[PDB]
Design a protein around this ligand. Structure first.
Ligand code: CU1
Length: 10
């Protein structure tokens, strides 16, 4: 997995 840590749907 990945998560948004710094985008439009962060
Ligand atoms: Cu980012």
């Amino acid at each position: 997995x990945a998560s948004c840590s710094x985008g439009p749907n962060c």
